[PDB]
């Protein structure tokens, strides 16, 4: 009977201008991808072709690139309003600059609703933030009515800096009542939209009752049926199918990340509001699809401050930052000692009153350190000087590990010494010792970490059966450089912020840095 098509994006992570196939930065215009203008083009074509359409976003279009560091959420709102977004949910990176950084730019200028149904305010923050986000919405699509409902992750307090007067409940219990009410409102078509992950999406399609479709994200998952057109390996079919406990078929969808793809799911309903048929596949925005000038002009005029700002002073140094290759891959090098300090300074959250902070450790490999920095230019540091050290557009990732995978990593890092290999590890919050005269696999003799279950920080030994939360780059978590143990024996993974921004905020705060070689690594 009734038909609608659904267009969704997720986890753009500030890839606002056109990008490469690895979604880092593209220099050959003839083989490039993504962008917001190309997306405008495709969206407008589909909108003219079809009468019933929905464009949705599932959160996390804030951390990444250099547009967020400078403007801080204004570009998001501007170009979302330009594209005619029909709704939006809240992710975990919308709270990076705090709620005060959320409310003004996004929540007040946006012309479209923002949703979450497990987020509740207590105390003085109840008056301020009431009326600005909603648990659910009703929209007239075509000649019918469509009900929406939102949800958001529960680990946001440990993955961002929201506050202490915002609560994050369980998804299912906070979701069911609104569905029930919506049904009592004579509304029979329901869509869930949220930023929680894939597995929880699956559970919401089994435990919750009344949900016709589930749109989601936060896991960076690829769903294709057929033959993939590019590098990404699909984890499943496109309209994923799950048998609900109430005897129904409920799809699930997710369009990878950045802007490399788009979603396109067509549905067929009946007179009562039940899903009959579902088919589609994600779109790939190659150069075959042209751009839209009225957007590129606006982008080009907004890009000036980006270049004006990359030649400016952030801070100062009085020492030589040896980001060389004969040092950072053979011994301890003070650039890493600077880098992990910033990494931790970023991961400072809340005092549970039984711990001073949940994570107290760093790991970093020497292959991610390209160039040095010399202090003989008035003692000045610039964004370019940093981009020349970390030229990959990576991220610093929070994970969990046992106490044995870590020893495996520290033993693999030193099993072939003397070849300028990028497997040497710079550390933070760790005291380690080596003895290179022993057989490979048994070269680590001492290893000490930093107490968290403790009011006074102190260095304690390692227990080969305990969970430790650690920070390390995405290149390592996905198994780069021979670190398969990490990708095989981890117990969770959450993405983080851009590296250059981390270091940038560290340096703009200290305002003068004199890092030193201390003895976090030594040989006996």
């Amino acid at each position: 009977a009734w038909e609608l098509t659904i267009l969704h994006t997720n986890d753009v992570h500030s890839r606002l201008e056109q990008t490469s196939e690895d979604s880092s930065k593209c220099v050959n215009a003839s083989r490039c991808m993504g962008g917001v203008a190309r997306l405008f083009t495709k969206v407008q074509q589909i909108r003219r072709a079809e009468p019933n359409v929905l464009l949705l976003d599932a959160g996390d279009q804030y951390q990444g690139t250099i547009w967020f560091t400078v403007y801080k959420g204004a570009e998001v709102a501007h170009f979302m309003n330009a594209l005619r977004y029909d709704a939006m949910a809240l992710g975990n990176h919308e709270f990076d600059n705090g709620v005060e950084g959320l409310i003004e730019p996004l929540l007040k200028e946006a012309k479209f609703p923002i949703l979450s149904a497990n987020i509740k305010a207590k105390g003085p923050l109840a008056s301020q933030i009431s009326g600005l986000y909603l648990p659910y919405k009703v929209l007239p699509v075509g000649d019918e009515v469509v009900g929406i409902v939102g949800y958001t992750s529960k680990e946001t307090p440990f993955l961002s800096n929201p506050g202490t007067n915002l609560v994050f409940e369980d998804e299912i219990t906070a979701l069911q009542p609104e569905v029930d009410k919506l049904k009592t409102l004579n509304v029979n078509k329901i869509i869930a939209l949220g930023h929680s992950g894939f597995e929880m999406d699956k559970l919401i399609a089994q435990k919750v009752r009344g949900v016709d479709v589930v749109v989601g994200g936060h896991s960076n998952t690829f769903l294709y049926t057929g033959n993939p057109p590019s590098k990404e390996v699909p984890a499943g079919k496109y309209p994923f199918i799950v048998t609900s406990d109430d005897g129904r078929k409920v799809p699930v969808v997710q369009a990878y990340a950045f802007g490399k793809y788009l979603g396109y799911l067509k549905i067929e309903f009946d007179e009562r509001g039940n899903v009959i048929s579902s088919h589609g596949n994600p779109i790939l925005l190659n150069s075959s699809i042209p751009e839209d000038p009225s957007i590129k002009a606006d982008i080009n005029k907004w890009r000036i401050k980006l270049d004006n700002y990359s030649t400016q002073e952030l801070g100062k140094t009085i020492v030589y930052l040896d980001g060389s290759s004969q040092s950072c891959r053979f011994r301890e090098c003070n650039m890493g000692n600077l880098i992990c300090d910033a990494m931790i300074n970023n991961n400072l959250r809340h005092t549970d009153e039984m711990f001073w902070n949940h994570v107290s450790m760093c790991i970093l490999n020497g292959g991610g350190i390209r160039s040095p920095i010399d202090e003989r230019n008035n003692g000045t540091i610039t964004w370019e000087n940093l981009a020349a050290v970390l030229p990959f557009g990576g991220t610093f990732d929070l994970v969990q590990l046992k106490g044995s995978t870590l020893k495996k990593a520290f033993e693999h890092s030193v099993h072939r010494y003397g070849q300028s290999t990028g497997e040497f590890l710079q550390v933070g919050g760790i005291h380690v010792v080596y003895d290179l005269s022993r057989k490979p696999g048994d070269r680590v003799v001492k290893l000490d970490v930093l107490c968290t279950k403790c009011r006074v920080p102190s260095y304690d030994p390692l227990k080969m059966d305990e969970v430790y939360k650690v920070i390390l780059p995405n290149f390592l978590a996905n198994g780069g450089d021979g670190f398969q143990m990490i990708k095989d024996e981890l117990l969770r993974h959450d993405s983080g912020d851009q590296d250059i921004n981390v270091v940038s905020t560290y340096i703009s705060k200290m305002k003068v840095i004199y890092p030193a070689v201390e003895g976090r690594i030594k040989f006996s």
Partner: antibody
Framework: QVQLVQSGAEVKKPGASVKLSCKASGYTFTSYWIHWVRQAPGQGLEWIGM????????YYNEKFKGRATLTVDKSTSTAYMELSSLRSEDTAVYYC??????????????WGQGTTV | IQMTQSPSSMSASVGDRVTITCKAS??????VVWYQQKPGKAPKALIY???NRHTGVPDRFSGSGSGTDFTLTISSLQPEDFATYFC?????????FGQGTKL
């Protein structure tokens, strides 16, 4: 193009049920939402609900649930209201309107005539 | 919601500048439309989105907003400016009009 006559003057002393109409001409009827309002004397205006020709799919404002229903004909292009269990203070003017707009700019444009009751 | 209006009883003589203020309970993001109702007739739209002017309105009508406070400014009074000026909302589903200020 022009919203036309709704009805004349109906008294309907307390207890009965009324049935108004809203006829339209000059455009394609089955393309726009139709809304009903009511301005009772002594207060402001009141929204009632949405009726869309082409299968209706109505929506009310959670104050008139069983006390009112919306119908459509179109064949002769007419919208029907229905007030049941009429109460004393229900005296007011009943209106008809069309919803018009493209992306974010929506507004009532062809306001219907008045039907005092 | 609740869309209150300030000047219930406002009177001025042709030739001056008049203003009307609309204040909402919650945050309606520039989703207010100003209406005009001549007595004994159906109203007519003046401004949609709180800033744009309906095709066919004199330049003497303006608008403001962007938040919880919305204002309508009238200048160059003419003998066609004296009626009731409502103020409604289309942001969240249950739409609330205003009481109405006469001029």
């Amino acid at each position: 193009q022009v919203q036309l006559v709704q009805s004349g003057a109906e008294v309907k002393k307390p207890g009965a049920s009324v049935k108004l109409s809203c006829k339209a001409s000059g455009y394609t009827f089955t393309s726009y939402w139709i809304h009903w309002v009511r301005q009772a004397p002594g207060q402001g205006l009141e929204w009632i609900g949405m009726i869309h020709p082409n299968s209706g799919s109505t929506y009310y404002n959670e104050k008139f649930k069983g006390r009112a229903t919306l119908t459509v004909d179109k064949s002769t292009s007419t919208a029907y209201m229905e007030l049941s269990s009429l109460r004393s203070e229900d005296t007011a003017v009943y209106y008809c309107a069309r919803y018009y707009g493209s992306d974010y700019e929506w507004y009532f444009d062809v306001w219907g005539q008045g039907t005092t009751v | 919601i609740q869309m209150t209006q300030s000047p219930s009883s406002m009177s001025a003589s042709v030739g001056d500048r008049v203003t009307i203020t609309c204040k909402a309970s919650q945050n309606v993001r520039t989703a207010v439309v100003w209406y005009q109702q001549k007595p004994g007739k159906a109203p007519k739209a003046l401004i949609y989105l709180a800033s744009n002017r309906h095709t066919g309105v004199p330049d003497r009508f303006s608008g403001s907003g962007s938040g919880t406070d919305f204002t309508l400014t009238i200048s160059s009074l003419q003998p066609e400016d004296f009626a009731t000026y409502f103020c409604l909302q289309h942001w969240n589903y249950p739409y609330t009009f205003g009481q109405g200020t006469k001029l």
